[PDB]
């Protein structure tokens, strides 16, 4: 149900906590069944929370560009409400859909209905809400030779032609106010411009100055200190599993790094882990 959620805190990698609301099991299954019953329109540029297309593809969409820009939607999930969903459906019996889809974080606000990050159905509705937003933004971008993707609160644009992304921020805002009234809003504090002169990266994947995806020198040094420790067996159980997971991540994003690590010490060492 809308109130059938459980709230908790998960910490942050630097300081502070984040508040999550995982649904109950029965409504979890009900919303999964609803997701299966009707598939929602989704734009290709939304390379997040879909089969196959992962972080690597979203970051590689901008590999072959030298000027990078992006903005972060302010309070993405919690802004979506019944009105946004139904306007999106109309633009292209219904009360139980409202009940199943949404969350009520306040005991008194029966109408304060929003998507939670925990909800397994939240990704599908989030992608569905911006089907025309992505349509128009990508149409404009490709009209001006701009590659645009969105990793779920990370609207990324890239291009090679100088002084074109400058108008893109404003564009975004305008379109937003046409589509979702004035409810969902951008985060002007996070908007970042970068070039081949600074530290570009999309969704955590670094983009080096040679138009290839990379783990970044930071990690490439961190999980090689970890490997040098494993060489002398100075890790632990959880730490060793952490190194294994990080090596798997580096294999997925930058297989060349794994090959070079193998050449560094051996093949059997990484088969062991």
Partner DNA sequence: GGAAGCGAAAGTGTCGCAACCCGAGAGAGGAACGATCTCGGGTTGCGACACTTTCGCAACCTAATACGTTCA
Annotated binding-site ranges for Mg(2+): 72, 153-154
Place of tokens 């919690």: 78
Distance set, CA 260 to CA 11, 122, 250, 266 (Å):
34, 39, 11, 10
- Which residue lies nearer to DNA by CB, 7 or 139? 7
Q: Which is nearer to DNA, 210 or 238 (CB)?
A: 238
The answer to whether 47 touches 147, Cβ cutoff 8 Å, is: no
Closest separation between CB of residue 161 and DNA, Å? 26
Q: Least distance in Å: CB of 118 to DNA? A: 9
Q: Which residue has the tokens 């040094």?
A: 221
Comparison of 152 and 184: residue with beta carbon closer to DNA: 152
Name, in order, each residue with C-beta under 8 angstroms of 33's C-beta and a sequence gap of 6 or more.
none
Q: Which residues bind DNA (CB under 7 A)?
A: 1, 3-9, 17, 19, 22, 24-25, 48, 55, 105-106, 108-109, 112, 117, 151-154, 203-204, 238, 241-242, 244-246, 248-249
Q: How far is the CB of 248 from DNA (least distance, A)?
A: 5
Burial category of 205 from C-beta neighbours within 10 Å (exposed 0-12, middle 13-18, buried 19 and up): buried
Instruction: Give the separation between CA 83 and CA 80, rounded to whole angstroms.
Output: 8
Residue whose CB is less far from DNA, 159 or 253:
253
CB neighbours (10 Å) of residue 47? 24
> What length does the chain have?
273
Annotated binding site: 72, 153-154
Nearer to DNA, 132 or 153 (CB): 153
CB 31 within 8 A of CB 101: yes
Residues 6+ apart with CB under 8 A from 127: 40, 42, 43, 46, 48, 49, 50, 152
Shortest reach from residue 249's CB to DNA, in Å: 5
Nearest distance from C-beta of residue 145 to DNA, angstroms:
25
Fill in the DSSP letter of residue 202. E
């Amino acid at each position: 149900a809308p109130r059938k959620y459980k709230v908790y805190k998960i910490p942050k990698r630097t300081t502070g906590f984040r508040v999550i609301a995982q649904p109950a099991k029965g409504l979890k299954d009900i919303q999964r069944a609803f997701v299966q019953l009707y598939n929602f329109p989704v734009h290709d540029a939304s390379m997040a929370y879909m089969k196959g297309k992962g972080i690597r593809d979203n970051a590689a969409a901008h590999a072959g560009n030298q000027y990078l820009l992006k903005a972060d939607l302010e309070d993405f999930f919690n802004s979506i409400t019944p009105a946004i969903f139904w306007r999106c459906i109309e633009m292209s019996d219904k009360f139980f859909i409202e009940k199943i889809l949404f969350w009520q974080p306040i005991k008194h606000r029966k109408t304060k209905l929003i998507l939670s990050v925990g909800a397994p159905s939240s990704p599908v509705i989030s992608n569905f809400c911006m089907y025309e937003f992505d349509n128009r933004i990508h149409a404009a971008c490709n009209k001006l030779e701009i590659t645009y993707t969105r990793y779920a609160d990370d609207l990324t644009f890239s291009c090679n032609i100088p002084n074109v992304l400058k108008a893109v921020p404003s564009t975004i805002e305008a379109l937003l106010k046409d589509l979702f009234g004035s409810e969902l809003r951008l985060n002007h504090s996070k908007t970042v411009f970068s070039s081949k002169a600074h530290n570009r990266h999309v969704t955590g994947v670094t983009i080096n100055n040679e138009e290839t995806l990379s783990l970044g020198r930071d990690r490439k040094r961190f999980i090689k200190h970890l490997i040098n420790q494993y060489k002398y067996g100075l890790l632990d159980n959880e730490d060793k599993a952490y190194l294994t997971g990080l090596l798997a991540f580096a294999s997925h994003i930058e297989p060349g790094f794994i090959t070079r690590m193998n050449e560094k010490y051996s093949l059997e060492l990484m088969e062991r882990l």
